[PDB]
Symmetry: C3
Subunit: 187 residues, 3 copies
């Protein structure tokens, strides 16, 4: 035992987890809203619309200790997504994305949320309609990332038929985010 190595998906955690952030509201009280995912170096972030639906002031908190204020770029009710913006100081951790990767049924996936961080393991039950997984999906990880064993982004964890969780396919999430950036809410 001492010689060998445990089976583990910590590799996918080290690659993906730095990019998943906490999302807060600062009214006047500091409340925890949910999780979120840093998509690129420009400083754009994806989260659930319901997380930021009633935010007086939005705050984002990285795992490395940094704390930015975020402005709502726009949302999309149908997919319950929302894009936030923050100033990117030199060096931002971003969620690994592979546009060429084709998600397959049976693929191992980790759901990464930041209520410290909590990570749960499952598989892709059904390929995206949305992507299904049996990894626990909850408010503590709602708005966070779903990634495969390599750490590549498979979807955005979302809430709202038992035992199964939902994530918005990363391919759809990318397009929706782009559209919100270009205009704002889109129909």
């Amino acid at each position: 035992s001492t010689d060998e190595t445990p089976a583990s998906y910590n590799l996918a955690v080290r690659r993906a987890a730095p990019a998943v952030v906490n999302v807060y509201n600062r009214g006047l009280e500091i409340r925890t809203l949910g999780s979120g995912v840093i998509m690129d170096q420009r400083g754009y972030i994806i989260t659930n619309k319901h997380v930021i639906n009633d935010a007086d002031q939005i705050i984002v908190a990285l795992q490395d200790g940094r704390v930015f204020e975020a402005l709502l770029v726009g949302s999309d009710s149908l997919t319950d997504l929302a894009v936030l913006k923050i100033n990117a100081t030199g060096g931002l951790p971003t969620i690994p994305i592979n546009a060429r990767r084709v998600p397959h049924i049976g693929d191992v996936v980790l759901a990464i949320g930041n209520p410290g961080q909590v990570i749960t393991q499952g598989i892709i039950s059904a390929t995206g309609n949305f992507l299904q997984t049996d990894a626990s999906i909850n408010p503590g990880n709602s708005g966070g990332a779903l990634v495969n064993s390599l750490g590549e982004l498979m979807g955005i964890n979302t809430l709202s038929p038992e035992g199964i969780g939902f994530a918005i396919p990363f391919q759809l999430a990318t397009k929706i985010m782009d559209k919100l950036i270009r205009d704002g809410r889109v129909i």
Copy 2:
């Protein structure tokens, strides 16, 4: 990441999933009853007795798009199983079976149900009394197949002590099916 391959049990899905079918009732209304498993080329299928307990007309629907009517060969209350029959057009997808394979505690297993298909992942908690697994077992996959990472049949998912699901060992399921074929309900 782009170079490497995700950890996945899609191999077992491709081999086993084509053999797991949807089971319907057609009264006079079309209702979804549950899932089922094509065992052989003769056209015999296994499902839960409770799925077909009140079926005016039984219909079976493959993943490839085909739709047959099925006749109840017989059932077995004690194990809550039931065998159906359909005409096998040339080419029927059958559930991989390995009579030589010895199921071990800790073995990875996928529960395959067809409410599109939903697949969940677990292990064999206890070897069959029935086989136990922590893979989600639900009406959406009740009557469907439980298979290992190779895609070989380990059991038939069944309902009716929390967090654990039950499957009838494939070795028992085979014998019971044979007996029903030979006579009908057996005691």
Copy 3:
């Protein structure tokens, strides 16, 4: 299929499972209290304090068929642990421990309980505050072992924020057990 081998964590089961015992009370009635873990050859065992909180007479039952009476060495309310003692006949199965092993987030873990034995699979969601896992933790495995794919001890399953289970890190559990052995209850 016939040639290849199923993916499985039965190796970790064979190594660790013999060391996880059933724990009973014998009033005057024989009641099942919970699970426990044989730590060393001296005959010391760890379990939850709530399991042994009201035991007139404590009995321990190995998987190999042996049955000892156990005496409460002492407990620790804060961590809900308790150490029992039994006479070690030549040959006692002990839980594999690796003091050098550093638990990482994403590590595969099996929760081993003895209500026959029930084993569930998960990962380390958060490294220990206590260790978190998405492996099912329940009364049937409360007080039992959490081990990685090698079979090394990662924690002691404990009860008392949804979908997640808790285990006391093996490093903390070892120290607490030592202290109880030295004195008794410690503050």
